[PDB]
With several copies, the nearest count.
Chain A
Amino acid sequence: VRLLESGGGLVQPGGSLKLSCAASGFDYSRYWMSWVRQAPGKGLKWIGEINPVSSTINYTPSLKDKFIISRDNAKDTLYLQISKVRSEDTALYYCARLYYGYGYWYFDVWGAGTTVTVSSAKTTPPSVYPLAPGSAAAAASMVTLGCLVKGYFPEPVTVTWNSGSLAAGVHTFPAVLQAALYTLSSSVTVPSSSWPSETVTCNVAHPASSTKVDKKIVPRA
C-alpha cells in the first residue's frame, strides 16, 4: 500500500503546475483522497479532498480556481493543479488517503511528498565532488568518507551510499542557500578494513532535473 506523488519542482511566479499522486496496494476507488501541504519548516495545512466518483470536491478558503483536484481511477492517480502561484505555495505537498474510526475522519496513509519551489531562478543539476581523506592515513578503526553536492536548484536531492548498503554511518547535512543555489555534504563512516578494499560510491540524485550522479570515493595519491 503505497502513495507516490510527483510533478513538483520549479514554477514561475503567477504560473501553474499539475502535481500527481500514483496509488498502488489498495482499491483506489472506494477511497477519498486528499492533499495536505507543509511549507519548509512550518506545520501541516489541508488543501482539499475529493470522493471516489469525483462527484464531491472540497477545498480550503481559496479563490476562484487556485486549487483544482482531479482524479483518474482508471489510472489510480490523484491530481492537483495550483495556478496564479505565489510564494505561499512553495511547500511540500502530501497526498493522503482518508478514512474514519467512529466517523470523525483522519488522514490514513500519507504519501512521501513532492516539493514545489516558486522562484524565478533556473533548474540547475548538481556537481558531485568526492571527499576522501588527505594523504595522511591517520587510520583509526574507522575511516570517514564524504561527498560534496554543490550548485543545484531547486530542492531537494537524495544522497545514498552503496545504494543503501551502507545505511548506518551516514549523515546528510541540510542544504544551504547562496546566490540562489543549494549545497550539501554527506558523511559516511566505515571500517578501515572495508576501504579502500571495497568500493565506496555515493549516489546523488536530483529529480528536478532527472539527474543522478554516482560518484565513487577514490583515495588520493
Chain B
Amino acid sequence: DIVLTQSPAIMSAAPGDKVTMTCSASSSVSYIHWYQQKSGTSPKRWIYDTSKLTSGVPVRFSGSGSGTSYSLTINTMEAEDAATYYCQQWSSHPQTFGGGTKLEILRADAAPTVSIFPPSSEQLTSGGASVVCFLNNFYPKDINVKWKIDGSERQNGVLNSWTDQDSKDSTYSMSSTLTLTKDEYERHNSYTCEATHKTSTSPIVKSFNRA
C-alpha cells in the first residue's frame, strides 16, 4: 500500500511568515487531501483534490503538486495556523494518511520561572515523599533538569513532563518530580533542582532545606 511521509516532522515559524510542508508518496498518487488537527479537536478537512480550499479555510492556505510529491503552504502564517497538518490520499486503495507535520509558533527566547515544592504533610503520612519542580514558560522547548539531594546528583525516581506549546504566550513548561519513600526522604536535608537552558550558562537553582 501507498506510503505518505510528511517531511518537516516538527517545525516553527514566526507569524506573518511563509510556511511550507510536504507529502511524498512511495508510488504515484492523484489528488491529495489535507487535514488540520489541533490538540483536543476533531481533524478538520482543510485542502482537497491537490489544491482546493474548504469553505472557511482562509485564502492564505494553498496546495499544489503532482505524481509523487505534493505540498501545503501558508502565505503569511498566523497564530491560529499552529497545528498538525495530515495529508491523506485515496487515488489508490486503500487510502493512507501521512505521519504528520507539527506546526509550532516561533517566538523570542524566554527563561524558566522555576518553583520547587516540598512534599505535603498529607502525602508524608501516607508514607510517600515527592518533591515537585516547576519550570514554567520558556522558549525554545529543549532544556535539562538536574536534581541534587544534599548536594549530589540523583537520577532515580525522577520523571519529567513537558507541556505542548501554550496558547497565550506560545511558550512551554516542564515539571520534574522526584519520588522517594518517606524513610529515604528524611535521611537528607537539602533538595535542590537545577535548570540548564539556552538563555544562560548559569542554571536557575531553586532549593529548600527542611531544617
Is any CB of A less than 8 Å from a CB of B in the complex? yes
CB distance from B57 to the nearest CB of A (A): 13
Residues 87-125 of chain B, each 1 if its beta carbon lies under 8 Å from chain A, else 0: 011110111111110000000000001011111111100
Chain B contact residue count (CB 8 A cutoff)? 55
Contact of B136 among A44, A45, A94, A171 (CB under 8 A): A171
Q: Does the CB pair A104–B161 fall under 8 Å?
A: no
Chain A contact residue count (CB 8 A cutoff)? 49
Give the residue among B91, B95, B99, B100 with the most A Cβ atoms within 10 A: B95
CB distance from A218 to the nearest CB of B (A): 9
Q: Does the CB pair B49–A134 fall under 8 Å?
A: no
Nearest residue, chain A, Cβ from B126: A127
Contact of B91 among A104, A168, A185 (CB under 8 A): A104
Q: Does the CB pair A187–B31 fall under 8 Å?
A: no
A68: Cβ under 8 A from any B Cβ: no
Contact of A43 among B86, B115, B177 (CB under 8 A): B86
Q: Does the CB pair B48–A148 fall under 8 Å?
A: no
Stretch at the interface among A11-19, A80-88, A172-180: A172-180
Query: Using a Cβ cutoff of 8 Å, how many contacts connect chains A and B?
Result: 142
List B58-77 residues whose CB lies under 8 Å from chain A: none
Q: Does the CB pair A146–B115 fall under 8 Å?
A: yes
Give complex CA distance A174, B119 in Å. 20
CB distance from A4 to the nearest CB of B (A): 11
Give complex CA distance A197, B94 in Å. 58
Q: B115 to chain A: which residues have CB within 8 Å?
A: 133, 144, 146, 187
A102-B49, A146-B132, A184-B161 known; A220 vs B118 contact (CB < 8 Å): yes
Q: Does the CB pair A94–B49 fall under 8 Å?
A: no
Give complex CA distance A140, B104 in Å. 31
Q: B97 to chain A: which residues have CB within 8 Å?
A: 36, 43-46
Q: Does the CB pair A131–B159 fall under 8 Å?
A: no
Q: Does the CB pair A178–B123 fall under 8 Å?
A: no
Give complex CA distance A130, B130 in Å. 11
A106: Cβ under 8 A from any B Cβ: yes
List A136-154 residues whose CB lies under 8 Å from chain B: 136, 142, 144, 146, 148, 150
Give complex CA distance A173, B90 in Å. 37
Nearest residue, chain A, Cβ from B134: A187
A residues with CB within 8 A of B:
3, 36, 43-46, 58, 60-61, 94, 101-102, 104-113, 127, 129-134, 136, 142, 144, 146, 148, 150, 168, 171-176, 178, 183-185, 187, 189, 220
A to B CB contacts below 8 Å, 28 in the list:
A44-B43, A44-B86, A46-B97, A58-B94, A104-B49, A106-B33, A106-B45, A106-B49, A107-B88, A109-B45, A110-B42, A127-B123, A129-B119, A132-B120, A133-B117, A134-B116, A134-B117, A134-B208, A142-B113, A146-B115, A148-B130, A168-B168, A171-B175, A183-B130, A184-B161, A187-B115, A187-B173, A187-B175
